[PDB]
Amino acid sequence: ADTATRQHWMSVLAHSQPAELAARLNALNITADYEVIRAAETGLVQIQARMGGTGERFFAGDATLTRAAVRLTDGTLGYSWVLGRDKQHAERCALIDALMQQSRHFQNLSETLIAPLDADRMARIAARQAEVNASRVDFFTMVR
Amino acid sequence: ADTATRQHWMSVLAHSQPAELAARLNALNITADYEVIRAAETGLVQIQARMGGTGERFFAGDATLTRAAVRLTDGTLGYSWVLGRDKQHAERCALIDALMQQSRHFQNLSETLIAPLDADRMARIAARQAEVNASRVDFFTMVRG
Amino acid sequence: NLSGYNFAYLDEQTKRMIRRAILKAVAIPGYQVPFGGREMPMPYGWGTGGIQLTASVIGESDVLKVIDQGADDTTNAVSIRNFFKRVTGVNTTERTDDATLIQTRHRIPETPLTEDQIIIFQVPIPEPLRFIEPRETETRTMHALEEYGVMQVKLYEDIARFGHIATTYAYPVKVNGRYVMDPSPIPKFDNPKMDMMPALQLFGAGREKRIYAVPPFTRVESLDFDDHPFTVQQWDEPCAICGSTHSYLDEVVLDDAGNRMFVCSDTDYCRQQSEA
Amino acid sequence: NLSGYNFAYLDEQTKRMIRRAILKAVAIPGYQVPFGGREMPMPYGWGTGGIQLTASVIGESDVLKVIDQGADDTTNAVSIRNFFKRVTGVNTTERTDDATLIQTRHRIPETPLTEDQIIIFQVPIPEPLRFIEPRETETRTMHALEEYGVMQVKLYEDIARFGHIATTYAYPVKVNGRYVMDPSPIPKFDNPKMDMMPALQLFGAGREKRIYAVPPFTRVESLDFDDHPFTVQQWDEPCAICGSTHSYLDEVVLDDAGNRMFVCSDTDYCRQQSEAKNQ
Amino acid sequence: MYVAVKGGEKAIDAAHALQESRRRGDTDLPELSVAQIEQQLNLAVDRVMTEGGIADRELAALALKQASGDNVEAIFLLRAYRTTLAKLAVSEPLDTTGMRLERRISAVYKDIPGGQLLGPTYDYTHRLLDFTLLANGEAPTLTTADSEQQPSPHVFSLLARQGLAKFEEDSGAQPDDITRTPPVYPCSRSSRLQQLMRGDEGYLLALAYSTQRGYGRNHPFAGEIRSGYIDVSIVPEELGFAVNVGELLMTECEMVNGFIDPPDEPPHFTRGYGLVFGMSERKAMAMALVDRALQAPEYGEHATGPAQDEEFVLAHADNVEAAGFVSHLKLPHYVDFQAELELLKRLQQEKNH
Amino acid sequence: MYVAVKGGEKAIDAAHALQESRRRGDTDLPELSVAQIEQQLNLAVDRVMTEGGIADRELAALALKQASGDNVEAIFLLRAYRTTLAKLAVSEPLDTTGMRLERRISAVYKDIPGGQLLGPTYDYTHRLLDFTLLANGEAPTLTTADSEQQPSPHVFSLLARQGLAKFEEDSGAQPDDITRTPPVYPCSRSSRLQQLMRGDEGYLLALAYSTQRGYGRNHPFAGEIRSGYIDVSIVPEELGFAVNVGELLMTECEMVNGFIDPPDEPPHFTRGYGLVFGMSERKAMAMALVDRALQAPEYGEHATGPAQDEEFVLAHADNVEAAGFVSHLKLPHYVDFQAELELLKRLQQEKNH
Amino acid sequence: TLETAFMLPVQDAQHSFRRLLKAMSEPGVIVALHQLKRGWQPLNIATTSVLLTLADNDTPVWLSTPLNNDIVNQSLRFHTNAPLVSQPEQATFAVTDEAISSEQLNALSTGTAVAPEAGATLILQVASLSGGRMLRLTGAGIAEERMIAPQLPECILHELTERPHPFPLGIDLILTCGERLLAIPRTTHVEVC
Ligand SMILES: O=P(O)(O)OC[C@H]1O[C@@H]2OP(=O)(O)O[C@@H]2[C@@H]1O
Ligand SMILES: [Zn+2]
Numbered sequence A: 001a002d003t004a005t006r007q008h009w010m011s012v013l014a015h016s017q018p019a020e021l022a023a024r025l026n027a028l029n030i031t032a033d034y035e036v037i038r039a040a041e042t043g044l045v046q047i048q049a050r051m052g053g054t055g056e057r058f059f060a061g062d063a064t065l066t067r068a069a070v071r072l073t074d075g076t077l078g079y080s081w082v083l084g085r086d087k088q089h090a091e092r093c094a095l096i097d098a099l100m101q102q103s104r105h106f107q108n109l110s111e112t113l114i115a116p117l118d119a120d121r122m123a124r125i126a127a128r129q130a131e132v133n134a135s136r137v138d139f140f141t142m143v144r
Numbered sequence B: 001a002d003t004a005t006r007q008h009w010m011s012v013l014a015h016s017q018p019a020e021l022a023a024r025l026n027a028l029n030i031t032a033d034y035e036v037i038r039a040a041e042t043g044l045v046q047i048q049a050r051m052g053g054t055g056e057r058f059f060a061g062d063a064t065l066t067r068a069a070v071r072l073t074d075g076t077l078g079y080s081w082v083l084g085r086d087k088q089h090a091e092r093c094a095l096i097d098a099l100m101q102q103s104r105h106f107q108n109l110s111e112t113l114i115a116p117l118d119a120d121r122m123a124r125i126a127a128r129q130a131e132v133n134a135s136r137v138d139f140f141t142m143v144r145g
Numbered sequence C: 001n002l003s004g005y006n007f008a009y010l011d012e013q014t015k016r017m018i019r020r021a022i023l024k025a026v027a028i029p030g031y032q033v034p035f036g037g038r039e040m041p042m043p044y045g046w047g048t049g050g051i052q053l054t055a056s057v058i059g060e061s062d063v064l065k066v067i068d069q070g071a072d073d074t075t076n077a078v079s080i081r082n083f084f085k086r087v088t089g090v091n092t093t094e095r096t097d098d099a100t101l102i103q104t105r106h107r108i109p110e111t112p113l114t115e116d117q118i119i120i121f122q123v124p125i126p127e128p129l130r131f132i133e134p135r136e137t138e139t140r141t142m143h144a145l146e147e148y149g150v151m152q153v154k155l156y157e158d159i160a161r162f163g164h165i166a167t168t169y170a171y172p173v174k175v176n177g178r179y180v181m182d183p184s185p186i187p188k189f190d191n192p193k194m195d196m197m198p199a200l201q202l203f204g205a206g207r208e209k210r211i212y213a214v215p216p217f218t219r220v221e222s223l224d225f226d227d228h229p230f231t232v233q234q235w236d237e238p239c240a241i242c243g244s245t246h247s248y249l250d251e252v253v254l255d256d257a258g259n260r261m262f263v264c265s266d267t268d269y270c271r272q273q274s275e276a
Numbered sequence D: 001n002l003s004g005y006n007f008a009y010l011d012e013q014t015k016r017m018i019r020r021a022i023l024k025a026v027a028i029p030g031y032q033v034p035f036g037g038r039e040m041p042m043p044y045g046w047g048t049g050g051i052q053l054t055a056s057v058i059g060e061s062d063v064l065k066v067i068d069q070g071a072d073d074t075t076n077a078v079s080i081r082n083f084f085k086r087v088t089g090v091n092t093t094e095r096t097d098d099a100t101l102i103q104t105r106h107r108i109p110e111t112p113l114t115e116d117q118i119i120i121f122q123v124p125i126p127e128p129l130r131f132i133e134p135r136e137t138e139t140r141t142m143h144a145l146e147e148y149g150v151m152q153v154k155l156y157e158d159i160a161r162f163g164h165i166a167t168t169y170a171y172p173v174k175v176n177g178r179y180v181m182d183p184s185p186i187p188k189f190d191n192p193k194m195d196m197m198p199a200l201q202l203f204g205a206g207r208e209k210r211i212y213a214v215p216p217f218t219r220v221e222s223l224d225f226d227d228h229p230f231t232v233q234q235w236d237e238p239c240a241i242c243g244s245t246h247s248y249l250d251e252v253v254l255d256d257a258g259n260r261m262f263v264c265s266d267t268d269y270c271r272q273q274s275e276a277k278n279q
Numbered sequence E, F: 001m002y003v004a005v006k007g008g009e010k011a012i013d014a015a016h017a018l019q020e021s022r023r024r025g026d027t028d029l030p031e032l033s034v035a036q037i038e039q040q041l042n043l044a045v046d047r048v049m050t051e052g053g054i055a056d057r058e059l060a061a062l063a064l065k066q067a068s069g070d071n072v073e074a075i076f077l078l079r080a081y082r083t084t085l086a087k088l089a090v091s092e093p094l095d096t097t098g099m100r101l102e103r104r105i106s107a108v109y110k111d112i113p114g115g116q117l118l119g120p121t122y123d124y125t126h127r128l129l130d131f132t133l134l135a136n137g138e139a140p141t142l143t144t145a146d147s148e149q150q151p152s153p154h155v156f157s158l159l160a161r162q163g164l165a166k167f168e169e170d171s172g173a174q175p176d177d178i179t180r181t182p183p184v185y186p187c188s189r190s191s192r193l194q195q196l197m198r199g200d201e202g203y204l205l206a207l208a209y210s211t212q213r214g215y216g217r218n219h220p221f222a223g224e225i226r227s228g229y230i231d232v233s234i235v236p237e238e239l240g241f242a243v244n245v246g247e248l249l250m251t252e253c254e255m256v257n258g259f260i261d262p263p264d265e266p267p268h269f270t271r272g273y274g275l276v277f278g279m280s281e282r283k284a285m286a287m288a289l290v291d292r293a294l295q296a297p298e299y300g301e302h303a304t305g306p307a308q309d310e311e312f313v314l315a316h317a318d319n320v321e322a323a324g325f326v327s328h329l330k331l332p333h334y335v336d337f338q339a340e341l342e343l344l345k346r347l348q349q350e351k352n353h
Numbered sequence G: 001t002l003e004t005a006f007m008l009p010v011q012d013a014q015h016s017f018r019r020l021l022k023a024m025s026e027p028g029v030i031v032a033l034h035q036l037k038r039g040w041q042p043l044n045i046a047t048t049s050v051l052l053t054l055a056d057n058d059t060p061v062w063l064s065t066p067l068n069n070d071i072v073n074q075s076l077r078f079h080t081n082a083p084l085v086s087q088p089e090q091a092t093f094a095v096t097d098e099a100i101s102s103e104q105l106n107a108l109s110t111g112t113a114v115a116p117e118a119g120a121t122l123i124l125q126v127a128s129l130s131g132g133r134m135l136r137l138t139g140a141g142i143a144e145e146r147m148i149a150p151q152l153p154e155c156i157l158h159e160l161t162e163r164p165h166p167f168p169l170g171i172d173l174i175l176t177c178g179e180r181l182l183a184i185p186r187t188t189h190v191e192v193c
């Protein structure tokens, strides 16, 4: 069932900020010899939407998507797909994807890299939700 | 001070940039006492344009117009209407108009205030026109395709 | 390489697809090979099919020669040359002799095309019989059926309607003895030049997205009748600059009252003659 | 009490023109009087016509009541009332019977209006025939000649298709036995309140540049057929708050399951019924 | 029992606070100035000046900054500000023949008096994003030529003196003012032009493009595009003579739109006119094309396409009205929708059960 | 049509230099960066992203900067830049039920499960020009509330569970892609929606306004407006499982339109749909309204307004095509006009000797 | 010299318009305009208030010869800037006294069927708002019935009772007596009892 965990940490990497991810990865002081089998390339991802939110598919434009791939010494392949055009960010995400598949870095990086990034993103999301919910319109309230 | 001369110096004042007018007037240091008949008021001027440039009139929108009127101790009324909203500029233009209506300041300001401002505007026009002419073109077409 | 852009301004997927289509077209001379690229907006009308081919086949070491109606001074030709200088950085020349890639609109250069050269023609319409057959379903199959007599109808009736063959532009040809192709609206004067040319000719239509190529030393013959052989009217007027009347002459307008003059369309050959 | 702007935010020429328009409208009950409407701080289609009418009419001694959807707590009503407070500094009330000027969007107060009260309506489409005939160049002549048969044809077609008249709000009325007038986008439930009312009714279409009015004690008759009379909205439930059964109710979906509660649109009347025991 | 409570004002105030926070954006960046928008986003400023109705670059830039770049919102801000100000005067009709030309081109004549002048333009440029603009830089030093400007009479003056066109002669008629009175269709050409100058540029551009379908490949020609400074002057009553109050950068397009043969008159080229503030060349050309299309009733033509339908074009041309009346659907409508719901429930309960 | 022109290289380069120097404006002011434009002029970037077709904030801001604030030129730049990019993947269909809401409103009910979340919006602001923006200041502090999002089911789900409307079911049909094959009319609804999302905002706004005023009325109700972040997901070939690549800020509009009486089904409401990048919602509302208008063949209702005309609406909504058409008319057509001159002159001689 | 205007032009004009609107929407009701303390003689208080609160550049004003004084014209075109016409048919606000004639009354503008509001308003100054013929009023603005006995000229009484101009055409009449004002719109049914 490692697919779900790999999806989780890949999404945490992609949704991260290049500044946050770069700073944390530099702080970790963790690096293993890797080769970029796929150079970080920024192209398009076609946006697919649904009529009425649930109906037939239609095309709703394109977004910028960057992808990179890195092979570690032992042959583990790490991939990345991040919206935008930050190729160094994509390379870092691919490197972390490769590292997280090694038993030496899985738990360590989950405790030190992925979980903290997810927590920071959740914290800022909650703050934004508070600011937004300040704008809610109240009509009725239960009274005992 | 004929009507043409008053029109000339009023146009020169209006086209003068507010900063240059203020700086040159302060450098002149020829300051007198005057009573603001009409406090500098900013409103709108309705723009009349012509169909094809020469036909019947229509209204091509509006532009901001700041008007001011001034009076001197000797009863000379000065005025200014300038595009924009700079009230201080409008009242200053009215002041200079009032001052130049009288021979005390007329010749002096015409020789050392209005003429330098007009010359500066002409120099700016000439520089811009030269750099624009740098893009003058002469296209030659070809028949068929 | 222009910053933020791919080399030759095209994504590598469109390049690869157009390259595959070009190879198929070369293997099938005269056949309008379809390719399924995307829609690309361009300011100048010329380029929907020619700029794509040039971007697909242009390299860093190529020397590019952009031609509009034979001329290099044309505004569109200069714009396309500058565009390829920006997005590829290639060298550009005013001489057909020193050029390795010649992108042209509706004109073959007067100078003979030598080996190791590719000439690219913008094709507004890649199938000549679009003026007769509205539905394309029969158009594709009739090529295999070889039913090329239908396009002979316009040639037959041109003399009836005018007394002479006036189809001096986009005159249909039969290449390799098999495939009826319609080049760009090049003049009848240049149609002979396509017969067994040393260079590789590429034809690309963008609004229809069809590519066809003429391999070097490929037999292409004008379509006509034995009783009315394909002939090019000789020019009895000289060029106002160099005088020589051995080259197709275009018209340049000098005033607003209709005054004009004839000058060699291929400005490169015109300069070669003038400097002689 | 103005913060730079003229009283009621409008210059005297604009208010004088609007006042002449109002007088003409009162003199021609039901007819749409064009006026030189100006662009207001509220976007067109958000009540600019009603705002301009109130600005022309309102005085320092007036108590303004602004309700949208029957409530003073609506966002648009809050904004309009706050704007008028900034530019006029007048008294503002939520009780209809205590108000002098009442500006409403899509609701006639449940409480009957008294003699000296002026109620001002916000109208998106002043023309009752606009949907049958989009062009004003035709509806102006249709009103000039009194060729209202097309509205009756529309009602007939609704009856034929559905067996019921399809129009539910903005239900066209006949005013003073002459003019087919479009009311505000009020529910047809409120249509009977316009008949022989003792209050002056003003209708401002700011985006469409039209003003019309119904004088006090003026005949107002919703259109209908003899065999298909005029009927009003009715709910099988009373109000979930005050237990009322004669007030225009509205749905408030509570949860995703599908549990509903019907409560009065006219919140002032709802409060009156709640404080005075329950219905 | 769900007692009603008040949360409306505290809702809108919080919403506006969030909107202003979004406007300011990230605080680590300097807040862009109104002057920067005026000097560098000059085409947005030109559009806002043209559609908002006030030729005041600083006001248009302020409206753009306050609208978070939303051009429609800035246009409506300037239009609402128009009501604040008082009409101090009315200028003399503008004289576009005395323009100080930033740009002057013609697509019909090569040798026009005064010479062709491409000026500042995006024409002939490659639509390649300049990624060097992602960082600081400076534009190239400007080339210079002769500093003198020759007289530049209108191209249509030449066309009229050649009998191919009709000179537009003022008859002294008083222009219509839609800002004073509501439009009354059919409209005079002055009213149509005034409305068009306020019309949304996308809508007018689409209408002009649709007018192409009416005819074949014989498109109109830009008889003359002329962008430059026009002197604005007024005749104040305190003086009685004309006073030069300033100058405005304006673009004037005269489109040659083909020739017609009026009865008992020699055929001549019909013309379309467009006048915009700033260098809004595309808007001016669209205005000229739509003006020519709306000239149908006076040429005895039949409306073939919406672009030639006067009421449809003019009633919806105004950006402020369309934007307001489309956005107003965000207003609550549960009273009206409840009336719809009741009818549909009754219809459902009778159609089936 | 196409007139070959020679001899303008120097003048064209000088004109481009002039245009770039004017875009930079007065060098005393700082250079308007791209991060500033995307943060502080966010609504212009929203429109340019939606119409151009690339949901990249920085690219749209760069295109706006290059175009000197012109939205049509910026859209052209972004649309052209889209050609140099490789299509790396196709996302999973967006699930707007998972949207992280910045704003959510419903005009069909007074209150709904989730609440009327105004969020950032200029609605209810008094459009009085704010002159304090002529100088620097400080953005207002944001009041905070419960940092939670309540279940916000789509209002159309509520309406459909009552039988008053129909769920939009997925038939599995492959969406049409105009970005690969030019549209052929009549075009499926997916192609229509794709073209509507790319249409000029100011033209679809006017078409929607026309429908509102009675030119093809559809009795619209803003059933729901949502603005928030939606996760984008792909299924790479290298892997086999869906990965999440980021989130996009988008606005979705679901219109409740007039009900119909199907021959063998209970009466129910119809519905339009709109979906745009960013928080520019009037574009989404106009998209929904024009979508419902163009659904006329689906519902078998004959068109009575221009907005119900599919060819008219869709063939001219593209900014790039109309802008290119208008720009062509500027190009030197000296020869073509000379042909017209001769044609006109003969008519003058024949009808006037 | 020129006659003065409202002491508080904004507030006084608002109050005068509200009184006039009360009178117009409820025909037969007498209202007092106590905001201007001295009318422009021959013009009384109510007529002067009406002119000051409704007249401006857009509305031509015709003054009957008995009321067509010089100082009144000066003050009217100075305070309101309203055009002063010489014929009744060119007027938006016609002003007259008991000496009105049938020709003048019929010359006024009744509007058009498509633009009924493009007509004229007759500001009539009467000897008294009581003591004349007893008149019964029914229509919009009147709950059941109203009784008023203004001293009207025979021509104006005929106009009111017979309405030669069908609705929506017609002139809205404003009877004025000193500070008191009564209004009869074109939609009011008047009989002489
Ligand atoms: O044109 P305006 O400014 O006078 O707007 C009047 C009315 O038009 C819109 O439609 P609505 O009735 O739903 O509510 C809005 C508004 O109250
Ligand atoms: Zn030669």
Ligand SMILES: [Zn+2]
Pocket: D239, D240, D241, D242, D243, D244, D247, D263, D264, D269, D270, D271, D273
């Ligand atoms: Zn209740």
Ligand SMILES: [Zn+2]
Pocket: D124, E328, E329, E333
């Ligand atoms: Zn509505």
Ligand SMILES: [Zn+2]
Pocket: E219, F001, F002, F003, F328, F333
């Ligand atoms: Zn052309």
